[PDB]
Structure 1
Amino acid sequence: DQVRRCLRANLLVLLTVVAVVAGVALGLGVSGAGGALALGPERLSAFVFPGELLLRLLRMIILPLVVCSLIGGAASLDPGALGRLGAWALLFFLVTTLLASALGVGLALALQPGAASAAINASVGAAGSAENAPSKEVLDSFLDLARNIFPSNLVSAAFRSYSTTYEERNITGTRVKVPVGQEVEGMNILGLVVFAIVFGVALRKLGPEGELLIRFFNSFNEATMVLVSWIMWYAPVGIMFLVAGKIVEMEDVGLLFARLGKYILCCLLGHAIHGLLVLPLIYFLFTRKNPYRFLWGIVTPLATAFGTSSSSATLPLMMKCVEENNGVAKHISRFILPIGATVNMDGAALFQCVAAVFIAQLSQQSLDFVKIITILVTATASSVGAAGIPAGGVLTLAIILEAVNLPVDHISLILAVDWLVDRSCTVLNVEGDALGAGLLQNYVDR
């Protein structure tokens, strides 16, 4: 019939979502047959490997993609039009992140997740084990991000970022701390974006002298998009083992719900309202077109983000699916998506704002109005250079709580349920710019 007509023509849509429900089904099946203790750590890592091979194999594409697509992108058009394009671009992610994070305030205020339950049983959450975090100061973090932009060595910017630590070497008579930088390991995605855009304007500022080299990076981009076409077919195999691997690791019974499940129901709902009902309403108001036609065409990287739980490890999947399944130009789509991959971490900002209210709803705190705007503007500003580190939501939450001087006594309670909720973060994180990609397609016609 015609049911097999839409079956073959939408195979990637069908094969991906049948895999993510297979991972939950396989994951609960192994936990029902004993679990990780039934297998042991010998045969455990062999089970989680063929999914973990995908998350490794996909990250090697973004170094010859991000630094190569921006030069081919941001050299076709005029620099005055680019600053015209960049002004509407950078304004869009800022308004989205403020509106998403303020949604997390009132959703967590008018629900009270600090309920008389096992959530207020947080005496198990302290545990005296990993209390003394590094927890860098709030001035040094925003100082670090500006230093992380414009990297020191350009080859060093491909695998190691810049960070800062603290040394207690002042035993002069006053035991005070001093900062020192050591360049810990993790890919500096933000540092290479700001180079390639600045380098891309310089070819445009040259005349026909740089006509050879703009054709070079245009071609080098194009073969990579052929190479990522083959990666997409392995992605239904990998996500089946990402989800099923993670279920076996953590004890997902008794602590999933019935201990703090009011909080998980709160923060998933914040990801449910924003991006699925809020961002399509913004897209409908500017385009007067059906957003769910546009949203269905990019369903494969959204399920990939729920597999990988990484925002930057779905960027090549998104750049293909927006370009092919929906009508966008090449240069205008292969420009806004890399820069809009590491500046608009609003699903983090939705997560990071609620959890700070969550521990303040308990333990009797009084954030009436002055603390609300400080906890709003700091979360939308800290969520810029939060790309490389895996548990960035836990690490950058301490600098929120220090600047609004709330108790950080049990941050371990937000931890160990963040394999699930931050997995929903990257779904919403890569969803905003993709709608923002098609939003700029509207009035680029005029």
Structure 2
Amino acid sequence: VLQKILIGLILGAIVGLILGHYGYAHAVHTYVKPFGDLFVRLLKMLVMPIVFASLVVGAASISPARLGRVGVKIVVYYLLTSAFAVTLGIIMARLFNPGAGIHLAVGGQQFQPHQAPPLVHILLDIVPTNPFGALANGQVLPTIFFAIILGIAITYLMNSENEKVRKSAETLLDAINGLAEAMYKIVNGVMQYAPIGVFALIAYVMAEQGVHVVGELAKVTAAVYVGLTLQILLVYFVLLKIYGIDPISFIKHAKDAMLTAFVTRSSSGTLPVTMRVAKEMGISEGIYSFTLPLGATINMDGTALYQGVCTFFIANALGSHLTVGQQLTIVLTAVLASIGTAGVPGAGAIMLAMVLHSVGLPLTDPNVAAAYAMILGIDAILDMGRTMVNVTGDLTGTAIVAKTEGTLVPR
């Protein structure tokens, strides 16, 4: 029930700030957060079953050729929106000018960012050498790959002349479809707990980081969140309408994944809600079962935009000036970064470091590190918004593609 999570969101926000103000933050950490973390875990639990099972069923429902057209379409969409995101972040930064006048003292946290594996590696790894391992290690891309191959192959089998082959292929499908159906059913149950979860999650963030949102760090929050707002209005909404979708209808249907993403701060972990949203939008499983898990890992408009704003904040705080040529470099790098970290765990951190280095602000610089460490103080706050844009772009792309594919039913 929407009312209820919205109450949880609002109540938790304010109680978090109140308790955080009176230095009862470590109480919230101890006694409250747990109930939030549970919600997250409960959702994450569904991910690898619901992604795998849904895709096998989906991949087997529609023609390979359509799937491939779907793939081209969304990939292009994911690329363009990402590029506009990081761009919009630069604009947002140049307009609001966060991080300026800051003269931080070196010391405190240092980082040695992990290096992104080469692009070839990352592409190759889309193909699992062991699908059972990919499922157990929770690797989404390889799971996507195998699910599709298996689904396609199942369809061939069901067109066999030998009944025995047909029947055993049907059984596997039905079993896997049983699992898919089950995971959607479980989502409905989990979402009853959402109010308590949503409450506890936001409460903790507000109690911990709500307080830190002051001075220049408020400028960053503003720039970021105005940026994120603008991506939704000026990009998604406009696009949705161009392709004959009512933005309000979409929000109406999408609201559940959007709210879950915001608090959960997990694109991956919101997937089950996202995927149910698309189902309830009446989108073909042959589409969203592919696009949404893909988008969840490679399509992060929120993050892109943040990377722009963060690069400028750090540059400002060091008194660096970013030429237009450097601004170009940021966009390019941001786009490449998300491609070249596609499967990689903790890809957000790596990307940022790549983007920062592209304009000569290595995180291994003590002055850069001081600046970064400052903005990290409120990352949870930032992460909520940007995660939610991350998910919302997936549904937008999925909606748009679904819409251009017109009528589409199983074979």
Q: How does 1:36-55 map to 2 (within 5 A)?
A: 36=25, 39=27, 44-55=29-40
> For residues 144 and 221 of structure 1, what CA distance do their matches in structure 2 show?
31
Q: Which amino acid aligns with 1:24?
A: A
Structure 1 counterpart of 2:147: 196
What is the CA distance between 1:148 and its match in structure 2? Answer: 3.8
> For residues 251 and 344 of structure 2, what CA distance do their matches in structure 1 show?
27
Question: What secondary structure, in the 3-state scheme, does the structure 2 residue paired with 1:257 have?
Answer: coil
What is the CA distance between 1:299 and its match in structure 2? Answer: 1.0
What is the CA distance between 1:89 and its match in structure 2? Answer: 1.9
Q: Is the 8 A contact 1:352 1:393 kept in 2?
A: no
Work out which structure has the larger RCO, using CA pairs closer than 8 Å and 6 or more positions apart in sequence: 2
Structure 2 counterpart of 1:300: 256
> For residues 70 and 443 of structure 1, what CA distance do their matches in structure 2 show?
20
- CA separation of 1:283/1:262 partners in 2, compared to 1, >3 Å: closer, same or farther? same
Structure 2 counterpart of 1:164: none
Q: Which amino acid aligns with 1:110?
A: L
Which consecutive residues of structure 1, in runs of 5 or more, have no partner in the other structure? 1-11, 161-186
Does 2:68 correspond to 1:91?
Answer: no
Structure 1 counterpart of 2:383: 422
Question: What secondary structure, in the 3-state scheme, does the structure 2 residue paired with 1:202 have?
Answer: helix
Does 2:106 correspond to 1:121?
Answer: no
Structure 2 counterpart of 1:313: 269
Which consecutive residues of structure 2, in runs of 5 or more, have no partner in the other structure? 161-165
> For residues 217 and 274 of structure 1, what CA distance do their matches in structure 2 show?
37
What is the CA distance between 1:29 and its match in structure 2? Answer: 2.8
What is the CA distance between 1:407 and its match in structure 2? Answer: 4.6
- CA separation of 1:361/1:134 partners in 2, compared to 1, >3 Å: closer, same or farther? closer
- CA separation of 1:415/1:387 partners in 2, compared to 1, >3 Å: closer, same or farther? farther
Q: Which amino acid aligns with 2:221?
A: I
- CA separation of 1:372/1:115 partners in 2, compared to 1, >3 Å: closer, same or farther? closer
What is the CA distance between 1:310 and its match in structure 2? Answer: 0.8
Structure 2 counterpart of 1:26: 15
Structure 1 counterpart of 2:53: 68
Structure 2 counterpart of 1:435: 396
**Correspondent of 1:244 among 194, 197, 203:** 203
Q: For each residue in 1:218-271, what CA deviation from the matched residue of structure 2 results, as whole angstroms up to 9, or x when unmatched?
A: 232112211221111111111100111223334x43x31124221111111110
Structure 2 counterpart of 1:365: 320
Which structure shows the bigger proportion of residues in helix conformation? 2
- CA separation of 1:416/1:151 partners in 2, compared to 1, >3 Å: closer, same or farther? farther
> For residues 130 and 220 of structure 2, what CA distance do their matches in structure 1 show?
43
Q: Which amino acid aligns with 1:266?
A: A
> For residues 5 and 342 of structure 2, what CA distance do their matches in structure 1 show?
28
Q: How does 1:216-365 map to 2 (within 5 A)?
A: 216-250=175-209, 252-253=210-211, 255-287=212-244, 289-324=245-280, 326-365=281-320
What is the CA distance between 1:192 and its match in structure 2? Answer: 1.4
> For residues 44 and 353 of structure 1, what CA distance do their matches in structure 2 show?
31
Q: Is the 8 A contact 1:136 1:399 kept in 2?
A: no
> For residues 80 and 147 of structure 1, what CA distance do their matches in structure 2 show?
22
> For residues 31 and 418 of structure 1, what CA distance do their matches in structure 2 show?
17
Q: For each residue in 1:17-69, what CA deviation from the matched residue of structure 2 results, as whole angstroms up to 9, or x when unmatched?
A: 111001112212322443136x4xxx842332111111112111111111111
Q: Scaled by the length of structure 2, what TM-score is found? A: 0.87
Q: For each residue in 1:352-375, what CA deviation from the matched residue of structure 2 results, as whole angstroms up to 9, or x when unmatched?
A: 122112212343334323322221
CA RMSD of aligned residues (A): 2.4
Q: Is the 8 A contact 1:142 1:382 kept in 2?
A: no
> For residues 404 and 115 of structure 1, what CA distance do their matches in structure 2 show?
17
Q: Scaled by the length of structure 1, what TM-score is found? A: 0.81
- CA separation of 1:29/1:439 partners in 2, compared to 1, >3 Å: closer, same or farther? same
- CA separation of 1:265/1:424 partners in 2, compared to 1, >3 Å: closer, same or farther? same
Aligned length: 392
Structure 2 counterpart of 1:130: 109
What is the CA distance between 1:434 and its match in structure 2? Answer: 1.0
> For residues 156 and 359 of structure 1, what CA distance do their matches in structure 2 show?
40
